[PDB]
Structure formats: C-alpha cells, structure tokens
C-alpha cells in the first residue's frame, strides 16, 4: 500500500537532487541507479516489469546506498520515496 503523498520540500534535500538527476537522465552516483524495480513484494500498485525503476537518495555520511530511494513509475510524475529501505513508500508531490 502507498502511505499517502508527501511534498518534495518535506523530504530530505537529497531527494530533490535525485529527481534532478532523473530529469537529466543522469549520470548518477551509484551503478544501481536506474535499474528496474521489480516491486517484488507488491507494495506499489501492480504494473508491468520495467514500469518501475529505482534511484538512490544519498544519505549524508553513508558508505553505502543506505535506506533512502526514489522509485519512478513510467506515469507522469509518478515517483515514490522510501526512507526505510523499501518497506514503506509515499508518492512525491513535486509541486510543493
């Protein structure tokens, strides 16, 4: 299930960075940025394989990708933020 919609400005600033890189088709900081997200656990709505992709939202100080991501859907501004390593997601509203 998607846990509601969140304004971009209420997310960590790194989420804004990640969306800016998605908008320019990268390049990206991690090799895993832009791989297909399978939605294996069906947390997000069911869509075709390849409908979703994932991108790192950098955690300051982390040596690894940490727990924060944006998952894109192929729909117009369909983007989800997770801060808890894909457990929960909120739809990102870039308008606020």
Residue that has been written with the tokens 């950098």 in this structure:
58
Q: With contact defined as beta carbons under 8 Å apart, do 34 and 53 qualify? A: yes
Which residues belong to the active site? 54, 85
The total number of structural domains in the chain stands at: 1
Q: How many residues belong to the chain?
A: 96
Range of the domain at 10: 1-96
**What CATH number is attached to the domain comprising 90?**
3.10.450.30
Whose tokens are 């509203």? That residue is 93
| β-bridge pairing 52-56 and 35-36 | antiparallel
Q: Nominal resolution in Å?
A: 1.2
Instruction: Specify whether the CB–CB gap between 85 and 1 falls below 8 A.
Output: no
Q: How was this structure determined?
A: X-ray
Q: Are 28 and 21 in contact (CB under 8 A)?
A: yes
């Amino acid at each position: 299930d998607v846990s509601g919609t969140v304004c971009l400005s209420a997310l960590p600033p790194e989420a804004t960075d990640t969306l800016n890189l998605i908008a320019s088709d990268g390049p990206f900081p991690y090799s895993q940025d832009g791989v297909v997200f399978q939605n294996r656990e069906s947390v997000l709505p069911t869509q075709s394989y390849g409908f979703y992709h994932e991108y790192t939202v950098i955690t300051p100080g982390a040596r690894t990708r940490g727990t924060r991501r944006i998952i894109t859907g192929e729909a117009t501004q369909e983007d989800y933020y997770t801060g808890d390593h894909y457990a929960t997601f909120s739809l990102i509203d870039q308008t606020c």
